[PDB]
Design an enzyme around this catalytic site. Structure first.
Site, mmCIF file in Angstrom:
data_model
loop_
_atom_site.group_PDB
_atom_site.id
_atom_site.type_symbol
_atom_site.label_atom_id
_atom_site.label_comp_id
_atom_site.label_asym_id
_atom_site.label_seq_id
_atom_site.Cartn_x
_atom_site.Cartn_y
_atom_site.Cartn_z
ATOM 1 N N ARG A 1 0.814 -1.212 0.000
ATOM 2 C CA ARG A 1 0.000 0.000 0.000
ATOM 3 C C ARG A 1 0.849 1.264 0.000
ATOM 4 N NH1 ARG A 1 -5.240 1.740 1.184
ATOM 5 N NH2 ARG A 1 -6.019 -0.284 1.936
ATOM 6 N N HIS B 1 -10.421 0.227 -0.040
ATOM 7 C CA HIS B 1 -11.005 0.689 1.206
ATOM 8 C C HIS B 1 -9.716 0.919 1.996
ATOM 9 C CE1 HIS B 1 -12.778 0.276 5.245
ATOM 10 N NE2 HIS B 1 -13.951 0.476 4.672
ATOM 11 N N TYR B 2 -9.758 1.725 3.050
ATOM 12 C CA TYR B 2 -8.549 1.989 3.831
ATOM 13 C C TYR B 2 -8.136 0.779 4.670
ATOM 14 C CZ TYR B 2 -12.035 2.684 7.534
ATOM 15 O OH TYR B 2 -13.084 2.521 8.420
ATOM 16 N N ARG B 3 -9.048 -0.176 4.799
ATOM 17 C CA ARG B 3 -8.786 -1.371 5.588
ATOM 18 C C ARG B 3 -7.948 -2.403 4.832
ATOM 19 N NH1 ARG B 3 -14.083 -3.032 8.735
ATOM 20 N NH2 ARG B 3 -13.828 -0.788 9.159
ATOM 21 N N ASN B 4 -7.070 -3.088 5.560
ATOM 22 C CA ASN B 4 -6.220 -4.126 4.981
ATOM 23 C C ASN B 4 -6.652 -5.491 5.494
ATOM 24 O OD1 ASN B 4 -4.487 -2.281 3.654
ATOM 25 N ND2 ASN B 4 -3.067 -2.224 5.396
#
Ligand SMILES: [Mg+2]
Length: 179
Positions: free
Chosen positions: A109, A124-127
């Site tokens: 990222r 999405h900002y989530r990993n």
């Protein structure tokens, strides 16, 4: 939603500020980890001087895999690879819906943020990092790792493919949480 975007990249090195993305591959799976489609696998044009500037293991690995030759022969730029991937993804999921899935994706990222911003923002900002589970297995249930081995393959497409299989493997030993 209900669809996940898996991605993996090959780089010239580990410095998220100086190194460059030389290969990228993506795969879209459903929430149950079934592959729905494989995205474009692109090697990105870099000069021979840049390649030889890499470490040693890096050079040997990319030479043996054939990526080294794909990079020199490539006519694709970072912007071009970004555009094609985003186009591929646009046919399976809207932007901002899926987390970034893979192994050690925080590192990936940070590379995307600098060289392929549009693609980074598509996530999405989530990993969803398989490494987190690998770390837990290693500390709590070592035996669980013995049943999985990564493909001999080297390209980014096989790596991402291995990440999905790895999670698929761990899911069997996750009890209730595994579903
Ligand atoms: Mg990787």
């Amino acid at each position: 939603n209900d669809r996940l975007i898996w991605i993996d990249l090959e780089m010239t090195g580990l410095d998220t500020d100086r190194d460059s993305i030389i290969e990228i591959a993506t795969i879209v799976t459903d929430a149950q980890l079934n592959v729905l489609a494989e995205g474009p696998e692109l090697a990105i044009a870099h000069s021979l001087e840049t390649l030889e500037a890499m470490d040693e293991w890096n050079r040997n690995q990319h030479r043996r895999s054939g990526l080294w030759q794909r990079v020199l022969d490539s006519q694709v730029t970072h912007a071009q690879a970004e555009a094609q991937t985003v186009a591929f993804l646009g046919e399976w999921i809207r932007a901002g819906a899926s987390p970034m899935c893979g192994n050690s994706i925080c590192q990936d990222r940070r590379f995307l943020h600098r060289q392929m911003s549009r693609l980074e923002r598509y996530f999405h900002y989530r990993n969803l990092d398989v490494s987190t589970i690998k770390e837990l297995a290693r500390r709590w249930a070592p035996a669980v790792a013995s049943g999985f081995a990564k493909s001999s393959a080297h390209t980014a497409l096989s790596d991402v493919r291995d990440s999905i299989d790895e999670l698929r493997h761990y899911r069997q030993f996750m009890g209730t949480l595994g579903g």
